[PDB]
């Protein structure tokens, strides 16, 4: 009816949005019930990066974490993956969109990071960009630990070690189940005949720099065995040195 043509009009507005105030019908989108229909009327695939930054701003600011999760999984993350794949870098507006999406961390981890990791096709540039984005944002310890348990339990991809390492650089107090999952993942790399890159070695090195004081002696010797079986000419002496000069408790 009359609502449909107004939302076609604001669809035409959002396809060319650069700056300024948006219509007030756009800002009351989360307060409505049938949001998916009017959102598909607004055609988010044809949005401008500034318009999607404002949409992420609005949707993150208005509570209801499940709906923010659905918006991040359905609209924001495909746009990010399409922009990295074609432009080989992330836009300024979309970068601040992902930061304002990390304003809501619970919908972010379960909507942006974990679906990207379980998609399997996550490239290295996407890993670097998203890891820098989680590096900039201060993250709650519970959400970071749950995401680290998630990424530890998953099947390995080369992009996963960057996320794991940049989560270990946060230097938070770690739950001991999380460290058990990390050690079990690395000891799951014990019998792999695949050549592992320097990224995996750097993730292990980071785990030994920051959490060597909270490692049991049995898993310490297991990590020494791990270094023995899967060596590197450069990093493995340093990981061995850091494991040798560690005090527990």
């Amino acid at each position: 009816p009359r609502v449909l043509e107004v939302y076609r009009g604001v669809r035409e507005v959002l396809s060319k949005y650069r700056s300024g105030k948006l219509p007030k019908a756009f800002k009351i989108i989360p307060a409505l019930s049938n949001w998916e229909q009017i959102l598909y009327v607004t055609e988010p695939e044809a949005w401008t990066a500034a318009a999607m930054y404002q949409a992420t701003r609005i949707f993150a600011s208005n509570l209801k974490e499940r709906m923010a999760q659905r918006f991040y999984n359905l609209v924001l993350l495909p746009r990010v993956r399409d922009d990295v794949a074609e432009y080989k870098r992330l836009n300024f507006h979309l970068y601040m969109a992902l930061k304002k999406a990390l304003f809501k961390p619970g919908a972010w981890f379960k909507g942006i990071l974990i679906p990207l990791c379980e998609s399997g096709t996550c490239t290295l540039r996407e890993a670097i960009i998203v890891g820098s984005i989680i590096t900039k944002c201060s993250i709650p310890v519970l959400h970071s630990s749950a995401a680290m348990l998630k990424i530890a339990e998953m099947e390995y991809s080369g992009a996963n070690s960057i996320f794991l390492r940049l989560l270990l650089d946060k230097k938070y107090a770690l739950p001991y189940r999380v460290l058990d999952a990390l050690v079990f993942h690395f000891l799951g790399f014990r019998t792999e005949k695949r050549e592992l890159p320097v990224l995996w070695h750097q993730c292990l090195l980071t785990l030994v720099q920051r959490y060597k004081a909270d490692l049991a002696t049995d898993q310490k010797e297991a990590l020494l065995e791990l270094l023995r079986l899967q060596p590197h000419p450069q990093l493995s002496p340093e990981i061995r040195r850091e494991l040798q000069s560690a005090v527990p408790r």
């Binding site: 009009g9 749950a146 739950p175 050690v183 049991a216």
Partner: protein, 48 residues
């Protein structure tokens, strides 16, 4: 769940894991009228 465990030295927080893995109108017409008024006020063409 693994087999090699924390052994000793304190439990600060218990952690909540069962929320991550276990997860998976008059105002409207008033805003429509405001949008129509704003679209009409872009070109006024009447007032002196």
């Amino acid at each position: 769940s693994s087999v090699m465990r924390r052994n000793e030295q304190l439990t600060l927080h218990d952690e909540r894991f069962e929320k991550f893995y276990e997860q998976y109108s008059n105002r409207l017409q008033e805003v429509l009228n405001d949008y129509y008024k704003e679209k009409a006020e872009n070109c006024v063409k009447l007032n002196t």
